[PDB]
Design a protein around this nucleic acid. Sequence first.
RNA 1: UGCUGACU
DNA 2: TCGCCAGAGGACAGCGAGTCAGCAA
DNA 3: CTGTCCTCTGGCGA
Lengths: 101, 76, 199
Amino acid sequence: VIHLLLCQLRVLEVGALQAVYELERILNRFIREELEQYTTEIVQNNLLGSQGAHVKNVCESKSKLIALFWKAHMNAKRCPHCKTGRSVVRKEHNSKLTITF
Amino acid sequence: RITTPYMTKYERARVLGTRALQIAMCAPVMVELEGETDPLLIAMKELKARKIPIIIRRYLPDGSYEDWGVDELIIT
Amino acid sequence: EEETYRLWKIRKTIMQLCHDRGYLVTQDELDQTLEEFKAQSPRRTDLTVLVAHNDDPTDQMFVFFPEEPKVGIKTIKVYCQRMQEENITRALIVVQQGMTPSAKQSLVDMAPKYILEQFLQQELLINITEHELVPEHVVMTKEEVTELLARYKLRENQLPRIQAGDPVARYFGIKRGQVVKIIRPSETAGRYITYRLVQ
RNA sequence: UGCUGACU
DNA sequence: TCGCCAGAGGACAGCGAGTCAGCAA
DNA sequence: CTGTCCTCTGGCGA
């Protein structure tokens, strides 16, 4: 997810909008080298479009991508590399963040 | 070369306004005014005689522009 | 014998769908009535059709009618084998209850090597394309989209969008990045023409 | 700045 | 054995313009 | 007041 979203953002920054689903399908059909080749090819062959990226249909896509990220992939989870890395930050009312043991 | 040949009403309004603001700033009147103190009446008198050396620069939605002459524009 | 009425309606709708995509279909198939459909053909493996394309005679399509009310990965493989051996690239899987959710991403996973696509059986009982409000869609060719963008000084983004899961983008089998011309019958101007990028 | 009235 | 279809409540944020006055904190 | 948006929230086969 990290690398997929990174590459999708790299392509959105220049306006390429088919590259989004193309990257996602390249991923599912398959990580950094697999995605970065296509993403660099897009960003190179489709530059000159940093000024033509501030359009509706390019802002909706970035909005949706980042919103889905913050909404679905930032929940507390058992840690990958060390299985016991949930030092659960759990914030009370603003001005209060409490880590556990 | 591809836009309409006529002068839209917004273009007439802005051209009259600019010609009037020029006349009012002591610009030479090429229309032989006949005792009128309004610069807008003088600007209309000039527009009717086809004496306005202004270039309407019509902008297309991608930055490309087309430069038309106020003389080469069908005023309705 | 209502199963036969459903089979006949679905077969007629799929013949119309294949003709609208530009496949060689005869008038009799498009004008086939029930009495003669049931006369010819009972099963769900001899309803499978294989159609050819106007141009690119190698480019043909294959329509499936799986038996399993809920097709799964194994069912998909069993005739992806058929397609790979008969040397075809496209398919069309008419399913009776749905596809188990893993299958939908498998059909997507098969790269342009063997591009498949699913259709529910209740989606084919009628031709939506024949509704009063649905306009006529026409997949533009790669050389007409360029002339459009040049005439309007456009970019491909900055054009209205049509969803890739649109019930009329799934029917006309339009891939992503393709522009479709749309002829709206307008009460104001007659035959208004619009364009939508499939995404 | 707010609460009371008031006008179309 | 928990992911996603379903399923629940909780929170927020909006609620037509524009005027005139007085009184009081 | 009412609506969406948002955030969970435990519950059967793969």
